[PDB]
Swiss-Prot record:
It comes from the Eukaryota. It comes from Saccharomyces cerevisiae (strain ATCC 204508 / S288c) (Baker's yeast). The chain holds residues 7 to 131 of 401 of the full protein. Coiled coil: none annotated. Residues 35-40, 94-103 have a biased composition (Basic and acidic residues). The gene is EAF3. Present with 1890 molecules/cell in log phase SD medium. This is Chromatin modification-related protein EAF3.
Length: 108
DNA sequence: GCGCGTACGTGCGTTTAAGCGGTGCTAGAGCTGTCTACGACCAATTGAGCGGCCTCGGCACCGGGATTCTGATATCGCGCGTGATCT
């Protein structure tokens, strides 16, 4: 499902975004395939370094926002995941509309 | 000044082709030599162009008249609203 250079979805806040995998980290043998060992200037977060994490560059966002990803924050870019990302988007939009309506009512 | 709506701007992704480096080919721009005929120069002269004067008629002036025409009001017609009568 998670192929090097492939497409996927990711967790960031309450809304999902499309991302492309640039590197994949194997913790058992401790290197990433883009087998290249950890660089001095490259650091993987400790919370996910022990697990197989993924370097992903997200679509619709500049190149200088990419970072490493564990299993939890990422998902396969399938029809179910696409629909659920859309659902999260509509939920956020409705929540914002409800908040602004509540503020307007309070002001009155 | 206010309100709407939409159409550029900003940004990210994908695609295109500009750009650079390299080599080949030959077309034409440049240069050189030679030669001829075209133009400047000169002299003579006569005729086309210019200054001037005269005659006249095209057009500027002035007066009277016809014609738009611009603006308002009003009349008449059409449409909308209110009242009265019929179903």
């Amino acid at each position: 499902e998670f192929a090097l250079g492939g497409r996927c979805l990711a967790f960031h806040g309450p809304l999902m975004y499309e991302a492309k995998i640039l590197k994949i980290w194997d913790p058992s043998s401790k290197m990433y395939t883009s087998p290249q060992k950890l660089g001095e200037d490259e650091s993987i977060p400790e919370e996910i370094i022990n697990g197989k994490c993924f370097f992903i560059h997200y679509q619709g966002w500049k190149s200088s926002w990419d970072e490493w990803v564990g299993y939890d924050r990422i998902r396969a870019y399938n029809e179910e995941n696409i629909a659920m990302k859309k659902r999260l988007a509509n939920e956020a939009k409705e929540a914002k509309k409800s908040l602004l309506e509540q503020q307007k009512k309070k002001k009155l």
